[PDB]
């Protein structure tokens, strides 16, 4: 599936609780963005999270 | 008990030709038509061929 290239960001699973505390499964996806980064060979578009994009990164 | 590979490797391949083709093959024809008695002669030639091939592969 879709997973972060720099770090190991991936989706998780929890519950969706209403006011009556009714349980329903759901997912929590990561903010994956498609950017073209430098590679030792040809630059490739890879799924990168917005957390790894901050603090300065080559594009 | 009776081993027939005391010879060298040159005459060895000549024995596997004589034992199988001219001897083992002829005994199977005489058994089909109903002409061969002494049926224990077949099992004897079958082992003489196997003993020759064992020593050949063993010499490598």
């Amino acid at each position: 599936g879709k997973q972060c290239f720099v770090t190991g960001r991936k989706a998780s699973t929890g519950n969706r609780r209403s006011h009556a505390l009714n349980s329903t499964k759901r997912r929590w996806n990561a903010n994956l963005q498609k950017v073209r980064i430098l590679v030792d060979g040809k630059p490739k578009k890879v799924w990168v999270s917005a957390r790894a994009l901050k603090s300065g990164k080559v594009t | 008990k009776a081993k027939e590979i005391r010879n060298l490797t040159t005459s060895e391949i000549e024995e596997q030709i004589k034992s199988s083709k001219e001897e083992l093959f002829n005994l199977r024809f005489q058994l089909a038509t109903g002409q061969l008695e002494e049926t224990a002669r077949i099992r004897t030639v079958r082992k003489t061929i196997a003993r020759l091939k064992t020593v050949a592969r063993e010499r490598e």
């Binding site: - | 199988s20 083709k21 093959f25 199977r28 024809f29 089909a32 038509t33």
Partner: protein, 87 residues
Amino acid sequence: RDILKRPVITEKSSEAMAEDKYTFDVDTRVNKTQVKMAVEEIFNVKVASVNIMNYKPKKKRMGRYQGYTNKRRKAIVTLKEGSDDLF
């Protein structure tokens, strides 16, 4: 090589059309091009044509142990010169 397995002697194809044709038994992985050359190497003859057929396994011992008989491959050769491929 020892392609031929056994000769067949029956009412048909033996004592009837046997002076010019001969019925043999071979292994089940051989074609008539090898059967033709193998006969000429053992009996020093010349073969005209070879016909080969197959047989399916046949049941046996109807009762306690119900098994199957082995399959066979029958060949029939015809000579132009020479004879006495059997005795």
